[PDB]
Amino acid sequence: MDLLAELQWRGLVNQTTDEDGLRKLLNEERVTLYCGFDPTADSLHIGHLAGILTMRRFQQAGHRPIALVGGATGLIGDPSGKKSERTLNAKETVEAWSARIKEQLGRFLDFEADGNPAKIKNNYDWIGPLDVITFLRDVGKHFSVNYMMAKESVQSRIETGISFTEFSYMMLQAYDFLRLYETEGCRLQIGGSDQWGNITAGLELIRKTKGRAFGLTIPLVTKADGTKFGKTESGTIWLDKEKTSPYEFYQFWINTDDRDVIRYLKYFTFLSKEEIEALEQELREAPEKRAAQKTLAEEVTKLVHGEEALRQAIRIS
Amino acid sequence: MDLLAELQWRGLVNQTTDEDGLRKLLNEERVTLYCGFDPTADSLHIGHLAGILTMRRFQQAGHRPIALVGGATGLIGDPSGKKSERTLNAKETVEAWSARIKEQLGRFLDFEADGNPAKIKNNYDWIGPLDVITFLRDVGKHFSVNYMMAKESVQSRIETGISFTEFSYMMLQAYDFLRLYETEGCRLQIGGSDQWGNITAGLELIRKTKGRAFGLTIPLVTKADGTKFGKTESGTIWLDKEKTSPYEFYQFWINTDDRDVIRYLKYFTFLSKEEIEALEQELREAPEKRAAQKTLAEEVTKLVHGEEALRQAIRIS
Numbered sequence: 274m275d276l277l278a279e280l281q282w283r284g285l286v287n288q289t290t291d292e293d294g295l296r297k298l299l300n301e302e303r304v305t306l307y308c309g310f311d312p313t314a315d316s317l318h319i320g321h322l323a324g325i326l327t328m329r330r331f332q333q334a335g336h337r338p339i340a341l342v343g344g345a346t347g348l349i350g351d352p353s354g355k356k357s358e359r360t361l362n363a364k365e366t367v368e369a370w371s372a373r374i375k376e377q378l379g380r381f382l383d384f385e386a387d388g389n390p391a392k393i394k395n396n397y398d399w400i401g402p403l404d405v406i407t408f409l410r411d412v413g414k415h416f417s418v419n420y421m422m423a424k425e426s427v428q429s430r431i432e433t434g435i436s437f438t439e440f441s442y443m444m445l446q447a448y449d450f451l452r453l454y455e456t457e458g459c460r461l462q463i464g465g466s467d468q469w470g471n472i473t474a475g476l477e478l479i480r481k482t483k484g485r486a487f488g489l490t491i492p493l494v495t496k497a498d499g500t501k502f503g504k505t506e507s508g509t510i511w512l513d514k515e516k517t518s519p520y521e522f523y524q525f526w527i528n529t530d531d532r533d534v535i536r537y538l539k540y541f542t543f544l545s546k547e548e549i550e551a552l553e554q555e556l557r558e559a560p561e562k563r564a565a566q567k568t569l570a571e572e573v574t575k576l577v578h579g580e581e582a583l584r585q586a587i588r589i590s
Numbered sequence: 591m592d593l594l595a596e597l598q599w600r601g602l603v604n605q606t607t608d609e610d611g612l613r614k615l616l617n618e619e620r621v622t623l624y625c626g627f628d629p630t631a632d633s634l635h636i637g638h639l640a641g642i643l644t645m646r647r648f649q650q651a652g653h654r655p656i657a658l659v660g661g662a663t664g665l666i667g668d669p670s671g672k673k674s675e676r677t678l679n680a681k682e683t684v685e686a687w688s689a690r691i692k693e694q695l696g697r698f699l700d701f702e703a704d705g706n707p708a709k710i711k712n713n714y715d716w717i718g719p720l721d722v723i724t725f726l727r728d729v730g731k732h733f734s735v736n737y738m739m740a741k742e743s744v745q746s747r748i749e750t751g752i753s754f755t756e757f758s759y760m761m762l763q764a765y766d767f768l769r770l771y772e773t774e775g776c777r778l779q780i781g782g783s784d785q786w787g788n789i790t791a792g793l794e795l796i797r798k799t800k801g802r803a804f805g806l807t808i809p810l811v812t813k814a815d816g817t818k819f820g821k822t823e824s825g826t827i828w829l830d831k832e833k834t835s836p837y838e839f840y841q842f843w844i845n846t847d848d849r850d851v852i853r854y855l856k857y858f859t860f861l862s863k864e865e866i867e868a869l870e871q872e873l874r875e876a877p878e879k880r881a882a883q884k885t886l887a888e889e890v891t892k893l894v895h896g897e898e899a900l901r902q903a904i905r906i907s
């Protein structure tokens with residue numbers, strides 16, 4: 274209703290399985306939602322903030338967020354949004370990264386809240402011990418090859434190539450949604466733009482096994498110049514202060530182009546509409562002052578590293 | 591060399607991965623070969639004799655046969671040679687059928703021979719305890735979806751439809767060959783006509799994991815009338831004497847059409863070429879006597895049920 278309308282105004286809604294159905298439920302009940310994060314490195318980066326901050330927004334509106342660490346799926350790899358087959362990381366590597374990722378996730382959510390405290394979960398717990406036979410029968414029987422082949426993630430790669438390993442990833446993600454739906458009353462799955470296929474596969478598996486639940490995806494952050502958000506000369510802008518210092522983090526944001534600043538304010542900050550609108554007028558009237566840019570930098574750096582860290586970055590600049 | 595030339599004369603060779611390579615090896619070494627049999631009922635039937643008797647022929651020529659009971663694969667189901675998706679049988683059902691099948695297989699092979707005694711194995715032993723993650727990574731990474739889609743068994747069903755469950759079967763069969771190759775020095779896999787794809791997938795997995803082994807398939811038995819071998823008005827001609835009595839079994843064979851009798855003699859019997867040739871001349875000269883037909887009936891009934899059982903069938907007729 275207003276949550277969903279707010280996300281729309283902000284530009285955080287790409288697609289939704291059934292908008293009126295989801296608005297209804299959001300407005301009528303405390304929704305358990307989840308977002309999945311796969312350890313593909315030893316730290317999250319700014320590519321993940323959309324999904325993280327969106328969860329936080331859901332939590333503030335009284336819903337209960339579940340942050341899922343991809344301990345199992347990180348051992349397979351998601352072809353989604355990747356033009357190329359990826360190399361398999363080792364169990365020890367992935368296992369190690371999962372622990373770190375778990376730590377950074379926790380920063381963004383409330384665990385003290387009564388009624389809607391978050392949960393951080395690891396899909397290793399339920400995928401780890403599953404035998405191939407059970408998996409092929411209990412999950413696999415529900416999907417035709419023809420349904421799976423039409424997925425953007427697979428359609429996009431058949432000529433380029435894709436192993437069975439990555440082709441099957443969607444089943445695992447599918448299963449996550451089912452398990453979370455059954456064990457935690459999870460009714461909504463959110464993800465980036467490229468997760469539509471995987472999310473809808475989870476709904477298909479739920480539908481076919483239960484015969485209810487929704488899917489929402491966030492759009493890819495755009496730049497007016499048409500370059501890839503987060504693609505710096507420096508390389509990746511990490512969330513680990515030891516890979517990307519608070520000063521570097523702060524600078525990244527402070528250098529937002531005038532053309533993008535208002536879209537980033539909306540996306541990454543907890544500034545109200547009237548605050549964001551005021552900055553737009555300020556952006557128009559006095560663009561050399563760079564008030565929108567400093568506000569973004571402080572807002573996002575505090576979120577991620579805190580006030581002390583922000584204080585340093587400010588004094589270092 | 592002569593084994594392989596004999597099978598050719600007999601019409602038991604449909605395709606071979608590399609004929610000269612396999613003839614060489616057969617002639618130079620004691621080859622460990624295997625054939626897989628999936629419990630799809632509580633008894634084998636005449637559709638399976640081609641593969642069983644062919645193994646026996648291999649064993650008589652000094653090679654070591656491995657009869658594989660599909661305890662794991664019977665829980666997935668092979669789309670090969672089936673125009674339609676099959677219903678999943680239960681573990682208890684399949685488990686029960688495996689035990690029976692094991693019993694009938696053993697009838698046809700030598701376990702007393704020193705140097706080449708048979709082995710009856712169950713793929714449940716190695717597929718049963720395998721986790722989905724290991725399976726997707728260790729087997730799955732080796733196959734592209736594009737390789738698998740081109741398989742006759744899958745090509746033949748994409749429009750008709752096929753679940754992921756059955757689509758993936760080939761991986762399991764693939765893995766069987768690998769495991770048997772590693773643990774038993776298995777260098778040759780034989781199967782019916784429809785198994786080409788599955789056999790070659792096992793070779794692809796071996797090649798890609800080891801960088802040697804061969805594949806041979808038997809042709810489908812033909813009828814001059816163009817009907818499906820084994821398709822009786824009675825229904826299936828089982829190998830279980832309690833489903834299909836020795837008398838019924840005997841009758842089936844005795845009713846072989848003159849047009850097929852010589853092809854069946856070659857395929858199902860251990861009669862020499864000069865014996866089989868002599869019967870052809872007898873078939874030409876005195877076709878009302880039905881000497882080819884009685885010889886087939888006695889030969890095959892003795893194999894499957896024994897002399898006592900043959901004696902009864904003869905006296906009952």
Ligand SMILES: N[C@@H](Cc1ccc(O)cc1)C(=O)O
Pocket residue numbers: 308309310311341343346351353396445446447449450468471
């Ligand atoms: N596939 C998602 C992560 C994910 C993992 C497991 C899930 O259940 C959901 C999402 C990604 O690559 O970002």
Ligand SMILES: N[C@@H](Cc1ccc(O)cc1)C(=O)O
Pocket residue numbers: 625626627628658660663668670713762763764766767785788
């Ligand atoms: N797929 C074969 C049986 C089989 C099972 C396992 C194997 O490894 C090989 C063959 C059939 O349906 O007849």
